[PDB]
Design a binder for these strands. Structure first.
Ligand SMILES: [Zn+2]
Ligand SMILES: [Zn+2]
Lengths: 99, 93, 148, 85, 83, 109, 99, 82, 94, 108
DNA sequence: ATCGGATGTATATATCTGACACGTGCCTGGAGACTAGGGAGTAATCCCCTTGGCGGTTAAAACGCGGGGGACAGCGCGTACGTGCGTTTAAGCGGTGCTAGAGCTGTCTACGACCAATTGAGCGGCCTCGGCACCGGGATTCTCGAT
DNA sequence: ATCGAGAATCCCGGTGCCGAGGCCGCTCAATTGGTCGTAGACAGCTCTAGCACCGCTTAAACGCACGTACGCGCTGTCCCCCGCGTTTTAACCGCCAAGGGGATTACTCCCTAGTCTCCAGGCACGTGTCAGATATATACATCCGAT
């Protein structure tokens, strides 16, 4: 009686919707708190301009999107549709981050 | 407050020359200004390095032309060189 | 602190068996400034020469080398009018484990034979390199008119 | 054989060895002397004059400077003057 | 006012949204920890240079220009925040 | 030319010749700066800006809007091949990404 | 009666022998001819110093060695031991050379 | 005149490079792709080398030009000058 | 006679004899050492000049070089190089 | 330090202070150069060179050799993690490759 | 091979709001005429080395065969993850208050640029002897078919 | 689990060669001394916005139940690189010969930094207004179970 989609269709719909738009995808306050926590280790009692946090978030989101774009290709290369940590490690090693 | 310089007016004039009807927002102005600064820095630095390699101590038009040839890809290089040569020829007389 | 204790122990070590043809002693109540008298080597053109030098200890020791200055004026390839000696041990490879006895014997050895590799003033170094006889005679004249 | 107080000392300060560090050249000295020499002296072994900056650079990350195998033994067999200093 | 383990603020739905934008159809259950670790490493690397830049200039507030300069130095130029 | 008007107009350019010349002269690039370098550099900059602005305007017209936004600039830069190769490492804030899905992921017919 | 090594044990010997050696691997005259034929297209009647040709050869060898290392990593990732052109294409795409 | 010299990169000359890289078993289609990518890389380097040579109003490609081109491409080389 | 050319060969040889008293170096490696020294000098000088220009300054003092060293070299190398340079400057001024 | 002696010896250094000063002046880096920058730069350069030379000498002595061929330099650079990170993109001439074989390829 | 629900996406119309485009003051930087000096264009010349060619020998490339081992197609397990609903949680927006600190301005002193004289640190050219390259001999050490 | 034959690799010893380290002659760049314009270090004031808090939403997150589809291990087939032996091919070394253009020096000129004076182009500031984001209500594309 109830109506529900097969596994996968909602994933494709979400992919289309998120590639169509441009808004940010990480909540602002948790990311700001994480950035402040990381920064307070290097030098205590720091202050952040309202634009530095936004620039950091933009850079991190772009880097993560690129990393997942490469990870999808890495996963598809092995006759799989699921991404797992070994794919991320292989992509990072090839890209030269830790080679 | 003090004077802060930018390429806003020139970019707006170029846009009005190309597209008479469309308009441009502030974030696009920032992006275009940053791109122009980046390309200017790249070209000027490459020209300075090219001048230093040849033991010369000046940056003439030919060094900027060779820097443009080195930096930009094959298809854009021809048009950029043609535009620069045309501008120099028109300016010299 | 530790520097004063090391100064006291090295003074005791010098007292129990002083090195030959060299004797050092503090100027007064303080231990930072010392004066040392040294006798010229026998196989040198500086026979019978007695030389007085002053050494100054910084607040930290032995981690900085002490500053040495020859009181008299000598004609040596590695010495100037200021009395400072152009020795790599004195400024370049000074080690905390090294004692003042070692540096004093090194200065005595430099008196015996100089080093032309890195002289402070190279004019008298090439003077030494040119002819041995007239360098010997001028050094003898200097040490006779200065040390005696 | 266990080493006595005569054969276990820091020659730099001529004081009883405390939390020593052992260089590859088999020369041992107490840690504060090592720190002050590595930042302020000629960055070499004061005894044999061997460049050791690579060794300390490698061992600083993992905190393997101290030679506990001998430090613990010296502290255990000489509790008195270790408590005094 | 110390802050502890705020890296958990990058929740699983945010990582799934980022992967969806990146073009991933199905995600394993162990991806989230690896993504958090990579993000932490990248943030540390960028913020160290940002703090060095703001400390050489004798200030106490990091500006967006310092972040842009650090990103450019690391090889990831960013438009839209001056330069 | 008649050397009576502005230097920017004397070369048929909308970018400022004087500002570019000053930037080259005082930018710590070389001991001397030639008289023809700023004109060439300004012409190149104007050509590149005009190309990108034209592509962005076309993308805006395709999307039925009339104000250029960073998404339009990102679309224009990434769609073209020459500018994509030129701006390989540039990250554009609030620019989104090209819409694409791998062929394997799409459902079977 | 003839003695034949098992398939895959001489390859390991070759790997061990070549990783410990440092000479150039491509013949000199064929590479010189290839470089001259490539360069004469851009500007006719060019002359090459020997050092320039040697530098080109050694840089090309280093680039190929790195590319084959990445290709071997990619091939091992897909539960294989052979290397195939798709591995090379994937490695180049991840490295950003082709994109 | 010279043409069709790409075959100078022989099959053993690529097998040796693969063995140095750490490859155990090789297919049969690798060689053509390797020749293609090597040709692309050589063209990319030679374009900048020839540009450097022509800018200085010279006619010989000095190794310094090759080193500068490699450094510009992001593959800095040590040993031949600089 | 050929014109004069400049290189860091003699200084590298002095350093090598300072660290290894009985180990010589080949010319093909002397060239590599010279190239390494030139590259590191160029990197540090360019970074310091860029940093000086970013603060609207016109002087490359020890602070700019030190911050460039901190930015460029990795952690332990940066710390050791900073300590060595500070010691050298202190010894030079006094 | 006491004056009236060469600059390269006042700091106890081995690299030339004057040549580094001239290069900084005439390298188009900045309009003015401070008096203390060349000493710090020369100290950093000499420290890095000493590190690389010491590692290369150890590698050469491991092979029963009394000369440092570029292969020893490559081994010294690659083996150390910090120098490898600093010189990741640099290619050493005739340096070969640090020997390694994947565990899967080895026979079972 | 579709039919009909059912969901979500796509499309047509009022509306109202804040960011975009234009008017204005003015002042700081750009333009114009003149001067002096050195950096670069141009002509001659030397000789370094790059291109061209021959002869030989031989290490490497080309070709063909036998075959074992690896790529790949298909199948069955079941476990991990997609999908959806109910509930709890902290992000988000507005509104105000406080002060640490970025930012701008006047002083003037110490640090650095500039230039003449000069000599020693450093570079070009020679050379010789020892560390390294090469060859013969044997001991050492994986390897594989046969048990 | 192993014995043993056959093949690749390392140690060792002897012989010869060429290039690296030391030395000499020399020319030019670093040093030292002195003078002078100015960069920024410092004190002081301003006022922006970064931080802190509080109250109210409702949007996103968390937990859990259910089902299915895909990662994975296993099995079987075939075909294709690998190891080896034989033959042809051109690389590599040494040699000779020539001339081209890379590098250097000398001469001269005109291009651009530097100076001062004059004026207008663009930046900070302010204000009117419509492009677009939003709400609201329909038309259509598409997914899923089952004939
Ligand atoms: Zn001690
Ligand atoms: Zn020792």
């Amino acid at each position: 009686k109830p109506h529900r989609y097969r596994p996968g269709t909602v994933a494709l719909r979400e992919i289309r919707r998120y590639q169509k738009s441009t808004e940010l995808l990480i909540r602002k306050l948790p990311f700001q708190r994480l950035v402040r926590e990381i920064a307070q280790d290097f030098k205590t009692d720091l202050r952040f301009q309202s634009s530095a946090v936004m620039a950091l978030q933009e850079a991190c989101e772009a880097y993560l999107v690129g990393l997942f774009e490469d990870t999808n290709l890495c996963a598809i290369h092995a006759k799989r549709v699921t991404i797992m940590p070994k794919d991320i490690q292989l992509a990072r090693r090839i890209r030269g981050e830790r080679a | 407050r003090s004077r802060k310089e930018s390429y806003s007016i020139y970019v707006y004039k170029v846009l009005k020359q190309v597209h008479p009807d469309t308009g441009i927002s502030s974030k696009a102005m920032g992006i275009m200004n940053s791109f122009v600064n980046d390309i200017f820095e790249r070209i000027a630095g490459e020209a300075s390095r090219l001048a230093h390699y040849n033991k010369r101590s000046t940056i003439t038009s030919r060094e900027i032309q060779t820097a443009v040839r080195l930096l930009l890809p094959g298809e854009l290089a021809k048009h950029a060189v043609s535009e620069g040569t045309k501008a120099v020829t028109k300016y010299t007389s | 602190h530790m520097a004063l204790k090391r100064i006291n122990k090295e003074l005791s070590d010098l007292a129990r068996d002083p090195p030959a043809q060299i004797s050092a002693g503090p100027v007064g109540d303080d231990m930072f400034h010392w004066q040392a008298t040294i006798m010229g080597p026998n196989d040198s053109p500086y026979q019978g020469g007695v030389f007085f030098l002053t050494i100054h200890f910084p607040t930290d020791y032995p981690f900085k080398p002490p500053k040495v200055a020859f009181t008299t004026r000598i004609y040596h390839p590695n010495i100037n009018s200021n009395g400072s000696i152009c020795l790599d041990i004195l400024r370049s490879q000074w080690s905390p484990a090294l004692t003042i006895s070692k540096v004093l014997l090194s200065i005595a050895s430099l008196l015996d034979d100089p080093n032309p590799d890195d002289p402070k003033v190279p004019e008298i170094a090439r003077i030494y390199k040119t002819d041995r006889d007239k360098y010997n005679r001028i050094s003898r004249e200097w040490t006779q008119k200065y040390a005696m | 054989a266990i080493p006595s107080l005569s054969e276990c000392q820091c020659g730099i300060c001529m004081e009883i060895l405390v939390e020593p560090v052992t260089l590859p050249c088999n020369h041992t000295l107490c840690k504060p002397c090592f720190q002050s020499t590595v930042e302020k002296a000629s960055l070499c072994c004061p005894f044999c004059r061997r460049r050791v900056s690579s060794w300390t650079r490698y061992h600083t990350r993992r905190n393997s400077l101290v030679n506990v195998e001998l430090w613990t033994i010296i502290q255990k067999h000489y509790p008195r003057e270790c408590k005094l200093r | 006012k110390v802050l502890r383990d705020n890296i958990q603020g990058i929740t699983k739905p945010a990582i799934r949204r980022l992967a969806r934008r990146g073009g991933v159809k199905r995600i394993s259950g162990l991806i989230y920890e690896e993504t958090r670790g990579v993000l932490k490493v990248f943030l540390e690397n960028v913020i160290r240079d940002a703090v060095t830049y703001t400390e050489h200039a004798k200030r106490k507030t990091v500006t967006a220009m310092d972040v842009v300069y650090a990103l450019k130095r690391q090889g990831r130029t960013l438009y839209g925040f001056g330069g | 030319s008649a050397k009576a008007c502005t230097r920017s107009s004397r070369a048929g350019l909308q970018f400022p010749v004087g500002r570019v010349h000053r930037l080259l002269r005082k930018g710590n690039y070389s001991e001397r700066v030639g008289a023809g370098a700023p004109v060439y550099l300004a012409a190149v900059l104007e050509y590149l800006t005009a190309e990108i602005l034209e592509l962005a305007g076309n993308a805006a017209r395709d999307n039925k809007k009339t104000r250029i936004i960073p998404r339009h600039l990102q679309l224009a830069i990434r769609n073209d091949e020459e500018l994509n190769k030129l701006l390989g490492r540039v990250t554009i804030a609030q620019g989104g990404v090209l819409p694409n899905i791998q062929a394997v992921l799409l459902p079977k017919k």
